[PDB]
Amino acid sequence: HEQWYEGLDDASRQFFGEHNTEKMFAALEPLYEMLKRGPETLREISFQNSFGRDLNDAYEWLMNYKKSKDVSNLNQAWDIYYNVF
Amino acid sequence: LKHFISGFQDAEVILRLQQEFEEQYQQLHSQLQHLQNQSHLQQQQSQQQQQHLEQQQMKIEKQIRHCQVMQNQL
Question: What family is this (chain A)?
Answer without folding.
Answer: Belongs to the PI3/PI4-kinase family.
